[PDB]
Amino acid sequence: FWRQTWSGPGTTKRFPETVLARCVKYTEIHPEMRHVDCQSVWDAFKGAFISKHPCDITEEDYQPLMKLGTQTVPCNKILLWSRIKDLAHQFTQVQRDMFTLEDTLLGYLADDLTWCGEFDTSKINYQSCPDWRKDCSNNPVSVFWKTVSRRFAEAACDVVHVMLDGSRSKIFDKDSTFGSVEVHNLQPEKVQTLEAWVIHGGREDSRDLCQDPTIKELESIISKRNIQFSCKNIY
């Protein structure tokens, strides 16, 4: 009758140190980001999520961080953020030729980390954080990715790509970052085509997943934005 915990992993151990070190490294390598004050970046990031219930985070909380992390991207070579992470697999040439969200400062900072705070202190919660499936799908991590990927989609032009997980119960899912935020922020003035690569999980070459009802739903959304749609099965 009284909630005792969140259901998800707590904040990654050493999170503050890790984010700061990543900021220092990225901004020493990238010739256009030398202006960045990594301490200010950390302060803005921490300020987004501390001293609040984790589920109460909103995109607006990340706006100070977004401002500090402003950065141009190569619009015509974007591979959007999706539930396919690792790289698909060993798509070596694709990785060479595509710009992914973790290739930006802000995506690089947060990649492969978990974080949250708590309502009653300004401390980082290392004990547990909301699980997307069990507690709340809009949490400090997922809302961070919604905020950054919104801007990323807005920047895209020409042919934009996304990799979809052909093994998911909803291959295109309106609740994912891609389905809730990115797809709706592709700009028809800039984007010619959205091409979805649907990654198969095996069973040789099974069904044509580009005919899946959820892909038809995606095709409809994109068509209504006056952008071309292309789907390919990647086996």
Binding track, positions 35-74, relative to Ca ion; x by CB under 5 A: --------------------x-------------------
Rg of the chain in Å (alpha carbons): 18
Give whichever of 38 and 136 is closer to Ca ion, judged by the CB atom.
Answer: 136
Question: Are the C-beta atoms of 117 and 145 separated by less than 8 Å?
Answer: no
* Residues of span 150-179 touching Ca ion by CB under 5 A: 176, 178
Closest distance between Ca ion and the C-beta of residue 17, in Å?
Answer: 23
Q: Is 125 in the site for Ca ion (CB under 5 A)?
A: no
Closest distance between Ca ion and the C-beta of residue 167, in Å?
Answer: 11
Q: Is 138 in the site for Ca ion (CB under 5 A)?
A: yes
- Active-site annotation holds for 38: no
The pair of three-digit structure tokens given for residue 169, joined into one six-digit string: 């119960």
Half-sphere exposure of 145 (CA within 13 A, CB side): 26
Q: Is 142 in the site for Ca ion (CB under 5 A)?
A: no
Q: Is 103 in the site for Ca ion (CB under 5 A)?
A: yes
Among 11, 27, 82, 149, binds Ca ion (CB under 5 A): 82
- Active-site annotation holds for 75: yes
Q: How many residues bind Ca ion (CB under 5 A)?
A: 8
Question: Are the C-beta atoms of 177 and 200 separated by less than 8 Å?
Answer: no
* Binding range to Ca ion, per CB under 5 A, among 33-41, 61-69, 96-104, 116-124: 96-104
Q: Is 146 in the site for Ca ion (CB under 5 A)?
A: no
Question: Are the C-beta atoms of 196 and 234 separated by less than 8 Å?
Answer: no
H or E element that contains 217: helix 213-224
Which 3-state string (H, E, C) describes 9-74? Answer: ECCCCCHHHHHHHHHHHHHHHCCCCCCCCHHHHHHHHHHHHCCCCHHHCCHHHHHHHHHHCCCCCC
Per the DSSP assignment, residues forming a β-bridge with 169 are none
Which residues of this protein are in contact with Ca ion, per CB under 5 A?
55, 82-83, 100, 103, 138, 176, 178
The residues carrying an active-site annotation are 75, 157
